[PDB]
């Protein structure tokens, strides 16, 4: 395959010393969770537990993540990646990393934060409410990006919002990575839905830009009330519905321009597809989320090349946010 970079912050880590980037040589400080008394279960994820704790020495509310301990070096990334983001604008805030007496088990413990519903709150949604969120997403993007930092895991569960203070923070940097210009990366990360195209035909040498393609399918889904926008059922077919908007033509364009050697179970599914326009999306329904402004800005985060693709940066810039 031909070899691709970022088009902002490159060389940030490379003209960073080892220590800020070297996460597997990161020594990890492991507290004491007396310190907190759990009050109940939030929910349970894939690799975690997360629960609503009270900080006794301060009599503080507090969210406790504690961690299904499956990879110590994944552990590790994620504690040096929360580390280096704290107090950056809308990132989750790591408070302490503690372990119980008895069980030893990691432990995450993060700034309390009050979930508003997703499902209750598509239906108060105004345009105004998208636009001000979407930006508040772009300035934790555009910080992590700064940082070096390709979160690899944007997606409507992990993006916190307490709608009556607006506060929005994204959360569960588990699958968070540093960027390197030149390094090939798994590809086996992200939701299925939220995959960028790069993921799907395996072209391991992404970057950033990765973040802006899943930011892309959450507003496509919130402007046009179709949860998700791109629904596949499995990794192969993920790329099949991508094509059924984007077109067959545009694909194979980007194939072509980095040399990408497509999978052969490719072969029966792919079909031949045309380019729809954005505007057959809209309804009666969704009309009053949807505008020329969004639409244009959407067709510009919705491009198979990561390459032309806007950053984080150039999004903040874009005439939709213009009202926020």
Known sequence: PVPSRARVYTDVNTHRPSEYWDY??????????????????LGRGKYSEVFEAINIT?????????????????????????????????????????????????????????????????????????????????????????????????????????????????????????????????????????????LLVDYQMYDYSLDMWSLGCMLASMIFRKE????????????????????????????DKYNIELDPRFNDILGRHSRKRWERFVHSENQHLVSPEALDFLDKLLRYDHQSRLTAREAMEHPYFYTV
């Open 58 to 198: 301060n009599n503080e509310k507090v969210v406790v993540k504690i961690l299904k301990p499956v990879k110590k070096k994944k552990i590790k990334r994620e504690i040096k990646i929360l580390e280096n983001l704290r107090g950056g604008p809308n990132i989750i805030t790591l408070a302490d990393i503690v372990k119980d007496p008895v069980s030893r088990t990691p432990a995450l413990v993060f700034e309390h934060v009050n979930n508003t519903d997703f499902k209750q709150l598509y239906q108060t949604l105004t345009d105004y409410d998208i636009r001000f969120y979407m930006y508040e997403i772009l300035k934790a993007l555009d910080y992590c990006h700064s940082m070096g930092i390709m979160h690899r895991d944007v997606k409507p569960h992990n993006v916190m919002i307490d709608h009556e203070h607006r506060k929005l923070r994204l959360i569960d940097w588990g699958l968070a990575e540093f960027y390197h210009p030149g390094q090939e990366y798994n590809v086996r990360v992200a939701s299925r839905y939220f995959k960028g195209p790069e």
């Open 24 to 41: 597997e040589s990161h020594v990890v400080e492991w507290g004491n969770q007396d310190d907190y008394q759990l009050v109940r279960k």
């Open 228 to 255: 998700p926008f791109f629904h596949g059922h499995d990794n192969y077919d993920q790329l099949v519905r991508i094509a059924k908007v984007l077109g067959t033509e545009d694909l194979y364009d980007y194939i």
